[PDB]
Design an enzyme around this catalytic site. Structure first.
Site, PDB file in Angstrom:
ATOM      1  N   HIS B  41      -7.773  84.788 -19.547  1.00  0.00           N
ATOM      2  CA  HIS B  41      -7.165  86.033 -20.074  1.00  0.00           C
ATOM      3  C   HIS B  41      -7.338  86.112 -21.595  1.00  0.00           C
ATOM      4  O   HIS B  41      -7.009  87.180 -22.169  1.00  0.00           O
ATOM      5  CB  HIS B  41      -5.738  86.255 -19.559  1.00  0.00           C
ATOM      6  CG  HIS B  41      -4.672  85.429 -20.194  1.00  0.00           C
ATOM      7  ND1 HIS B  41      -3.843  84.618 -19.455  1.00  0.00           N
ATOM      8  CD2 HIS B  41      -4.289  85.295 -21.478  1.00  0.00           C
ATOM      9  CE1 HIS B  41      -2.971  84.041 -20.251  1.00  0.00           C
ATOM     10  NE2 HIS B  41      -3.237  84.410 -21.493  1.00  0.00           N
ATOM     11  N   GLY B 143       1.099  83.292 -27.826  1.00  0.00           N
ATOM     12  CA  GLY B 143       0.180  82.382 -28.534  1.00  0.00           C
ATOM     13  C   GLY B 143       0.174  80.988 -27.912  1.00  0.00           C
ATOM     14  O   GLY B 143      -0.722  80.194 -28.288  1.00  0.00           O
ATOM     15  N   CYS B 145      -0.201  80.126 -24.639  1.00  0.00           N
ATOM     16  CA  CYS B 145      -1.113  80.004 -23.471  1.00  0.00           C
ATOM     17  C   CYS B 145      -2.270  79.070 -23.851  1.00  0.00           C
ATOM     18  O   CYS B 145      -2.735  79.122 -25.008  1.00  0.00           O
ATOM     19  CB  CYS B 145      -1.610  81.358 -22.973  1.00  0.00           C
ATOM     20  SG  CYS B 145      -0.443  82.097 -21.806  1.00  0.00           S
TER      21      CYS B 145
HETATM   22  C1  U1G Z   1       0.895  82.677 -22.886  1.00  0.00           C
HETATM   23  C2  U1G Z   1       0.380  83.555 -24.017  1.00  0.00           C
HETATM   24  O1  U1G Z   1       0.102  83.050 -25.099  1.00  0.00           O
HETATM   25  N1  U1G Z   1       0.254  84.886 -23.829  1.00  0.00           N
HETATM   26  C3  U1G Z   1      -0.295  85.726 -24.899  1.00  0.00           C
HETATM   27  C4  U1G Z   1      -1.311  86.713 -24.368  1.00  0.00           C
HETATM   28  N2  U1G Z   1      -0.694  87.527 -23.321  1.00  0.00           N
HETATM   29  C5  U1G Z   1      -0.068  88.691 -23.634  1.00  0.00           C
HETATM   30  O2  U1G Z   1       0.392  88.888 -24.756  1.00  0.00           O
HETATM   31  C6  U1G Z   1       0.009  89.746 -22.652  1.00  0.00           C
HETATM   32  C7  U1G Z   1      -0.796  90.802 -22.400  1.00  0.00           C
HETATM   33  C8  U1G Z   1      -0.225  91.510 -21.316  1.00  0.00           C
HETATM   34  C9  U1G Z   1       0.919  90.827 -20.972  1.00  0.00           C
HETATM   35  O3  U1G Z   1       1.072  89.749 -21.788  1.00  0.00           O
HETATM   36  C10 U1G Z   1      -0.273  86.687 -22.197  1.00  0.00           C
HETATM   37  C11 U1G Z   1       0.724  85.640 -22.658  1.00  0.00           C
END
Ligand code: U1G
Ligand code: U1G
Lengths: 304, 304
Positions: B41, B143, B145
């Site tokens: 993602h 941030g 992930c």
């Molecule tokens: C786990 C992590 O860092 N994230 C950041 C990127 N993302 C989002 O911001 C997002 C986009 C749509 C829903 O969440 C997933 C989580």
């Protein structure tokens, strides 16, 4: 989201742990620059630890009696001295992994990470608080002495604790890195009882703020209180008195949540008086007091 | 003495964390050998994450669109592929700090350390369990992930988790390092509800053993039970069924303490039925289920 009891990353401290052996006693030491710091009781036979005279015991010890091993490589000891309850062993090699560091003496209620070690090798890392009775509730087996407590500010390790002893009640006592015990404890196997382990009020409030930020809100009530009224309830429940200094420190969490500190005091007051009624807050059935206001801001903002 | 929620030392994993940026999305990646592993993602606009077609989104991306930074040095990406829900970015330099490592897919009830990171920089380390509903209860902000979960066996890091998403209920979902989600979760911003978060029975028993070993014994009673009788009570309290496999795993803790597993089952049964009555066990007011029998042996024996 989510709130966890979180230790600092330990790598910078892992790079500093060595094994110190004097005769048949093996402990951990902290190698910073060309100095290895370890508990002075490394020189004692467990017999000695009944009533040790450290100056007299140390006369019988030479540089070559202190065996210092970093991984599986021996360091050459070129000098030794006693400072309070620690030994400083001068070695001929600067630790190449020495981080930026300071020695700090923390106040009761301050939190820190412990890197539990045995034979100079890290076994695990956990978060602690200096209790108001100057004990810590750690996880320390035989061989763990010389394990250290620390905070990290970006790239600077502030060392605040070195592990020296277990009290008969299974709580822990140690020194700063100048070898001065926290509290009234001594490196002697004698009757040493801890005082009242009071709850760190400002830390509970910080954690109630953390809970609100993370969606745990059931305990927010319609009430407020005053510092004096709150403090009467605190005294009754062996909570530390709350000061205006503590209120000032909680200001940013107050600001972020829009809950006045004295409103959160009144929520904590009802929790003390009424209990949790079988409910939980951030996965706890009791009021957590080993997060500082600084810890809550750091973890809620994601500082590295 | 003392028993603490203890994470593995994180240094070996600290040495593997990098920053991955695709357009305006910055996450963490895991650099092992000449491969960087990160959540797929990374390629999505938050708009994309409503109903992303990852194969189609990835066609628009080149090696040079994946910005990989290790400390403040850029890595050259020479290949990229999608495996399940992770991207594998081939870089022209082997990570010089690559530890001995494996990828393992853990079972529910298994515990692991998380190194929470932001922009490829470690912020903290905590201990987790894979919940029976294949969620974890973590501490993850935007941030975070690509932060990973791991166990260490002496010098070998077994990577079991990469963080991908937060459910609307503030619990966490992610993948093994082959990019296969734990549980039924998908890397899409949609309705995803966790099932029953049941208690890891074998872990509670291990922790009751830990408590006995560390002197917390008030909950030991005069009773025994059978697996079937115990399991009726477990079912009623949303505890995982206890199997003979679980009894076998607790054998060494049984041996060390001299408390038969079914006697400790009967103690846990009374705790479930009667509650704690305002008492604590190892500083907890609830029954802790994020220590494995292996965790209890390790911490009680001081493995490094
Ligand atoms: C786990 C992590 O860092 N994230 C950041 C990127 N993302 C989002 O911001 C997002 C986009 C749509 C829903 O969440 C997933 C989580
Ligand atoms: C903290 C630690 O590692 N130790 C080991 C050395 N030592 C003893 O075994 C001892 C001697 C007399 C009483 O305890 C202190 C604790």
């Amino acid at each position: 989201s989510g709130f966890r009891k979180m230790a600092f990353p330990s790598g910078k401290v892992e790079g500093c742990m060595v094994q110190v052996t004097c005769g048949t006693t093996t402990l951990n030491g902290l190698w910073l620059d060309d100095v290895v710091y370890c508990p002075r009781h490394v020189i004692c036979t467990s017999e000695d630890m009944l009533n040790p005279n450290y100056e007299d015991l140390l006369i019988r010890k030479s540089n070559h009696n202190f065996l210092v091993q970093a991984g599986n490589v021996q360091l050459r000891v070129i000098g030794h001295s006693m400072q309070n309850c620690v030994l400083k062993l001068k070695v001929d090699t600067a630790n190449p992994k020495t981080p930026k560091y300071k020695f700090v003496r923390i106040q009761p209620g301050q939190t820190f990470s412990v890197l539990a070690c045995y034979n100079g090798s890290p076994s695990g890392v956990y978060q602690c608080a200096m209790r108001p009775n100057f004990t810590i509730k750690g996880s320390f087996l035989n061989g763990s002495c010389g394990s250290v407590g620390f905070n990290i500010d970006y790239d600077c390790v502030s060392f605040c604790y070195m592990h020296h002893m277990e009290l008969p009640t299974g709580v822990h006592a140690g020194t700063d890195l100048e070898g001065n015990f926290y509290g009234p404890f001594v490196d002697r196997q004698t009757a040493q009882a801890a005082g009242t382990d009071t709850t760190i009020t400002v830390n509970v409030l910080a954690w109630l703020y953390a809970a609100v930020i993370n969606g745990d809100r059931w305990f927010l009530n319609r009430f407020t209180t005053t510092l004096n009224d709150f403090n009467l309830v605190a005294m009754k429940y062996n909570y530390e008195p709350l000061t205006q200094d503590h209120v000032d420190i909680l200001g940013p969490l107050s600001a972020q949540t829009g809950i006045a500190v004295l409103d959160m005091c009144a929520s904590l007051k009802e929790l003390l008086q009424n209990g949790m009624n079988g409910r939980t807050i951030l996965g706890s059935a009791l009021l957590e007091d080993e997060f500082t206001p600084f810890d809550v801001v750091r973890q809620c903002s994601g500082v590295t």
